[PDB]
């Protein structure tokens, strides 16, 4: 609810101007448990009051923050605004103290005011701060106007022994060493309170954030009967985090999690019988975040009746998105059906399996199919991956005479086993049916059956025209992953290395080889949400590989600022550096600079006129700005690069559309 007016009461002398400057709950603000929690912490830390009962009141359909203050007596020396700023006896001399010097100096006659015993209640509070008393009873003997104000006090006996029971994790000697109110000193109520706070803090530091105190008593014999309860997870349950789901109720379908129970169970690191090591919880939440299908996870401790140490820890889980269907179609003269539709389902069947159908079409005779299935972990297995993806690509390249049209049918399969949570070894095979087509009207075949190309009025024999051939290949690859999140990684390392060697038919039937190394890393940049990202792609291939399967450099995937396939060859190395900035939750500003070039083509098609030797030379460079906006309907990318340095191509702006 919003706020209509902040009407503060009881703030009779503590400045309304000062508090309204300090308080951030102005009119029209938002009401949230975290918001008022932070506000309560802020005003408590400010020190403009000792005790506050800030009760928000509903008013005019909004919230009226009513703050009930109990100000201290030691901030008036600021002199830049300030708080709350005939009697003859105080009577009842004490035993341990004289309660005349102490009172009349620290508390009485300055804060005692000789009457109005609210600051005298504060006086007994500071006596508990010195702890030298236990209970103070102000009995005002007002006679004929004058008052005696007898202050019947109870004095704390010195502690004879300090006994800790049920610690069971931290040795009692260290606990006693941390203790401030040692035996032989007077029992001290507020020092006892701060000592318990420090004990809790020490337990927090040693890795146990779920320990309470229960009892902190001292009997008449001056025996500080200290009690500490550890808190041992007896049962850990998982239910979805029911946040402010506007427009939705707590229906049985809403609160149930589509993801199966075993997926969450195999990821939890907290184990029963252990005292809630917060590092274990941090590891569990890190794993759950790295799973990708979640956005936020919180824990909650609930007591089990009849079991003091028992804690029924319950995990809260947020689901982001399982099914998606995004598509965009442009048509009508000029180009063709420029359709880019997807059916990504990255929680298909609730088993974390990624399942998706992708269709793409463009003006440059591009057609794409992809039925990708991937299981990062088979149900009840020892971390063994699985998946298969069938793809068809009717790629067209009008700039190549011999390879005007390229058809592809592929059915790949990859299975992998993980040597830990960061090393992944996998073997993946595929089968391809490729049909190559030449440019009609540019290649002439004579009656002998051979093909000739006319350059400066002479015929050159060109072979491999209209090539149709199968293509079988396998590759064992190892990958190293440390990214925190797959969708929007912020810090980590990602190295992939595959060695490919397969058999191909058609022209020059034989067995070809291939290798590829790709490194991706991230680290923190200039400021908040500024992430520096580095990607270097490397790969070599034997000359026996088919021309269509040779490495391509260009486009929005590898090298911006140049057309697709600007560089071709059997040796490719592309390095890219990006600076992504997350200004909000729906847009992202990215500045990128990339460089790379393929080498050693030695191909038949004379279309490639930039065949350059000397690996590591003539490396084209590009840079530009990019927009990575997180639309409510799905991720989307925009890229604009300027070809800089050596300007082999005279083109300027470049546009790219992708997810």
């Amino acid at each position, epitope marked *: *609810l919003p706020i209509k007016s902040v009407e503060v009461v009881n703030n009779q002398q503590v400045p309304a101007s000062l508090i309204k400057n300090t308080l951030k709950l102005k009119e029209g603000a938002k*009401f949230s*448990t975290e918001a008022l929690l932070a506000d309560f912490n802020a005003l408590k830390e400010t020190g403009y009051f000792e005790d506050v*009962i*800030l*009760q*928000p*009141v*509903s008013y005019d359909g909004g*919230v009226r923050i009513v703050v009930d203050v109990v100000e201290k007596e030691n901030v008036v020396d600021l002199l830049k605004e300030k708080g709350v700023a005939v009697l003859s006896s105080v009577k009842f001399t004490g035993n341990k103290r004289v309660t005349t010097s102490e009172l009349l100096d620290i508390t009485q006659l300055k804060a005692g005011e000789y009457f109005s015993r609210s600051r005298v209640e504060d006086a007994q509070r500071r006596l508990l701060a010195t702890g030298k008393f236990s*209970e103070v009873r102000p009995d005002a003997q007002v006679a004929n106007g004058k008052m005696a104000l007898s202050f019947e006090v109870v004095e704390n006996p010195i502690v004879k022994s300090v006994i800790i029971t049920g610690n069971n994790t931290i040795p009692t000697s260290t606990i006693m060493s941390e203790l401030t109110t040692k035996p032989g000193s007077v029992q001290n109520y507020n020092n006892l309170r701060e000592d318990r706070d420090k004990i809790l803090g020490l337990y927090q530091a040693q890795g146990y954030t*779920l320990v*309470n*105190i*229960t*009892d*902190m*008593s*001292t*009997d*008449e014999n001056g025996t500080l009967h200290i*009690s500490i309860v550890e*808190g041992i997870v007896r049962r850990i349950e998982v239910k979805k985090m029911v946040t402010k789901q506007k427009g939705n109720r707590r229906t049985p379908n809403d609160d149930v999690l589509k993801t199966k129970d075993y997926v969450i169970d195999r990821e939890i690191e907290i184990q029963p019988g252990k005292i809630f090591n917060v590092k274990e919880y941090d590891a569990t939440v890190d794993n759950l975040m790295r799973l990708g299908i979640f956005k936020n996870v919180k824990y*909650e*401790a*609930r*007591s*089990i*009746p009849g079991d003091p140490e*028992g*804690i*029924d820890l319950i995990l809260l889980i947020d689901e982001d998105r399982t099914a998606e269907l995004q598509g965009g179609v442009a048509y009508g003269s000029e180009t063709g059906f420029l359709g880019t539709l997807s059916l990504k389902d990255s929680n298909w069947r609730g088993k974390n399996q990624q399942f998706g159908f992708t269709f793409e079409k463009s003006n440059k005779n591009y057609t794409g199919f992809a039925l990708d299935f991937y299981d990062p972990w088979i149900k009840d297995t020892d971390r063994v991956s699985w998946g298969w993806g069938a793809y068809r690509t009717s790629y067209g390249d009008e700039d190549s005479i011999l390879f005007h049209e390229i058809d592809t049918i592929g059915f790949r399969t990859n299975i992998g086993k993980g040597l830990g949570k960061n090393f992944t070894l996998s073997l993946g095979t595929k089968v391809e049916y490729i049909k190559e087509k030449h440019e009609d009207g540019k290649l002439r075949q004579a009656n002998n059956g051979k093909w000739y190309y006319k350059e400066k009025n002479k015929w050159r024999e060109i072979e491999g025209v209209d090539d149709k051939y199968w293509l079988w290949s396998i590759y064992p690859y190892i990958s190293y992953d440390t990214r925190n999140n797959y969708l929007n990684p912020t810090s980590g390392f990602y190295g992939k290395f595959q060695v490919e060697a397969g058999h191909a038919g058609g022209y020059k039937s034989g067995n070809f080889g291939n290798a590829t190394l790709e490194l991706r890393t991230y680290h923190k940049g200039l400021f908040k949400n500024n992430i520096f990202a580095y990607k270097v792609v490397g790969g070599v291939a034997t000359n026996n590989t088919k021309e269509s399967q040779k490495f391509w450099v260009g486009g929005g995937n590898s090298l911006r600022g140049y057309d697709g396939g600007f560089f071709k060859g059997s040796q490719k190395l592309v390095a890219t550096i990006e600076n992504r900035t997350q200004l909000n939750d729906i847009i992202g500003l990215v500045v990128f600079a990339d460089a790379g070039r393929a080498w050693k083509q030695n191909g038949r098609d004379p279309s490639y006129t930039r065949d350059n030797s000397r690996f590591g030379h003539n490396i084209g460079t590009t840079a530009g700005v990019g927009i990575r906006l997180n639309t409510p309907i799905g991720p989307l990318r925009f890229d604009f690069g300027w070809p800089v340095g050596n300007k082999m191509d005279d083109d300027g702006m470049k546009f790219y559309f992708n997810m």
Partner: antibody, heavy 127, light 106 residues
Framework: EVQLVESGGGLVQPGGSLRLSCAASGFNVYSSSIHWVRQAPGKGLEWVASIYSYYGSTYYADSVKGRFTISADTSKNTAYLQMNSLRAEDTAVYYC????????????????????WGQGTLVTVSS | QMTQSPSSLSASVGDRVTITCRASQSVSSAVAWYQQKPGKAPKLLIYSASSLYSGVPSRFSGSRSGTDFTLTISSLQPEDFATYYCQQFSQRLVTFGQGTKVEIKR
């Protein structure tokens, strides 16, 4: 095994005084809340006072702003409610009830409901 | 604030009964009502929208309807005919409802 027993009740005249005691039997008052409620005969229940230990907050509901005091010491694991200047409506039973927040971490002292209720004591103010 | 409820209600064994409880507070308001047996002492049976873990025969349940809180008790039982209260928790202000009585209809 947790239960509470009330004692110190008795018979007084208007303007009199008393001291009501509630003793814990298995939990420690240093962490629990101990709430006092009363039920006038043939009428509903009405909150009186509550002393949250572990926080040192002791404020009384409506009719006890200056009349009675509730003080609890953990030495004898009991809570003491003072009585003075009692009036006609004070003739009722008195229940001491522990308040329990569903969270195990005992830094969350919000009441969230009273479960363990004592036996009750009858106090009559009639002259 | 007053948290008024309908004082007199009559039902029968096996019937489904409801009891509204008006209120006026913020979002952080939580209610908890007790089946006060007419002789000994009240007993908690709901926290804010969920029942107490130990004592409930899976009958008493309820939720919040705006500023009104209701109970959906299952088929009535001979031992459940008692006085049922209502309460709401603001920032250190325990308010109790006027209370309702449940008895047979004949």
């Amino acid at each position: 095994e947790v239960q509470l027993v009330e004692s110190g009740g008795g018979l007084v005249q208007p303007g009199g005084s008393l001291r009501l005691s509630c003793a814990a039997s298995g939990f420690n008052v240093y962490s629990s809340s101990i709430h006092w409620v009363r039920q006038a005969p043939g009428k509903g229940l009405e909150w009186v006072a509550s002393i949250y230990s572990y926080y040192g907050s002791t404020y009384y509901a409506d009719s006890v702003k200056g009349r009675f005091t509730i003080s609890a010491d953990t030495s004898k694991n009991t809570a003491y409610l003072q009585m003075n200047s009692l009036r006609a409506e004070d003739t009722a039973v008195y229940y001491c009830a522990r308040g329990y927040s569903s969270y195990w971490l005992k830094s969350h002292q919000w009441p969230y409901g009273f479960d363990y209720w004592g036996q009750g004591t009858l106090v009559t103010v009639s002259s | 604030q007053m948290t008024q409820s309908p004082s007199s209600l009559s039902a029968s064994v096996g019937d489904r009964v409801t009891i509204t409880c008006r209120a006026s507070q913020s979002v952080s308001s939580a209610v908890a009502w007790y089946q006060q047996k007419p002789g000994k002492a009240p007993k908690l049976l709901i926290y804010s929208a969920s029942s107490l873990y130990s004592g409930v025969p899976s009958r008493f349940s309820g939720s919040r309807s705006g500023t009104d809180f209701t109970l959906t008790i299952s088929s009535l039982q001979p031992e459940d005919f008692a006085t049922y209260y209502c309460q709401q928790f603001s920032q250190r202000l325990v308010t109790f409802g006027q209370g309702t009585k449940v008895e047979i209809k004949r």
